[PDB]
């Protein structure tokens, strides 16, 4: 069995290493293209997850949860920045690391304040483990409607979403 913080910690690990391998890609390649719009589906699927199971779970931590979900429309808000210049733009890969930068920003706010479950939290190894089952179940059907939404309905419709 996994537990909520070893879903969560290991699909940061992956969302860390595609920005790591983004910012790696040349500047407009079709390597880095493609591998922008796996961040924006693993992106996605985590905001989903937090909002949809693991933050209802830690809901007794009124204002970690407010600050989490004020930190994902900094995300959010931020992408639709980045999403105004094209890659073959002078100035985007500045934009990309500011991106990366407000990315970075939720990633250790979470990894500070949220996981473990905060002390006004009451919850046991079992409800943990319980949880984690369901988060990792909810992300493979989040990632599935994440890709059907980009391959049918394109990268805008992925965006709108968040």
Same mark, same amino acid.
């Given at each position: 069995?996994?537990?909520?913080?070893?879903?969560?910690?290991?699909?940061?690990?992956?969302?860390?290493?595609?920005?790591?391998?983004?910012?790696?890609?040349?500047?407009?390649?079709?390597?880095?293209?493609?591998?922008?719009?796996?961040?924006?589906?693993?992106?996605?699927?985590?905001?989903?997850? *937090?909002?949809?199971?693991?933050?209802?779970?830690? &809901?007794?931590? /009124?204002? +970690?949860? $407010?600050? =989490?979900?004020? !930190?994902? @429309?900094?995300?959010?808000?931020?992408?639709?920045?980045?999403?105004?210049?094209?890659?073959? *733009?002078?100035?985007?890969?500045?934009?990309?690391? &500011?991106?990366? /930068?407000? +990315?970075? $920003?939720? =990633?250790?706010? !979470?990894? @500070?304040?949220?996981?473990?479950?905060?002390?006004?939290?009451?919850?046991?190894?079992?409800?943990?483990?319980?949880?984690?089952?369901?988060?990792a179940a909810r992300?493979?059907?989040?990632?599935?409607? =994440?890709?059907?939404?980009? @391959?049918?309905?394109?990268?805008?419709?992925?965006?709108?979403?968040?």
């Amino acid at each position: 069995m996994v537990n909520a913080y070893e879903v969560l910690k290991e699909h940061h690990v992956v969302i860390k290493g595609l920005g790591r391998k983004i910012s790696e890609a040349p500047v407009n390649s079709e390597e880095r293209h493609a591998l922008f719009d796996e961040l924006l589906i693993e992106l996605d699927i985590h905001f989903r997850i *937090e909002d949809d199971l693991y933050y209802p779970a830690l &809901s007794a931590a /009124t204002k +970690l949860i $407010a600050v =989490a979900h004020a !930190e994902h @429309r900094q995300v959010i808000d931020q992408l639709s920045v980045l999403l105004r210049t094209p890659q073959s *733009e002078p100035g985007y890969e500045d934009e990309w690391n &500011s991106f990366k /930068t407000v +990315l970075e $920003a939720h =990633a250790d706010e !979470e990894e @500070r304040d949220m996981i473990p479950a905060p002390p006004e939290v009451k919850i046991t190894d079992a409800e943990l483990e319980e949880l984690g089952e369901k988060m990792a179940a909810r992300m493979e059907q989040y990632r599935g409607s =994440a890709l059907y939404k980009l @391959r049918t309905k394109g990268r805008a419709a992925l965006v709108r979403s968040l």
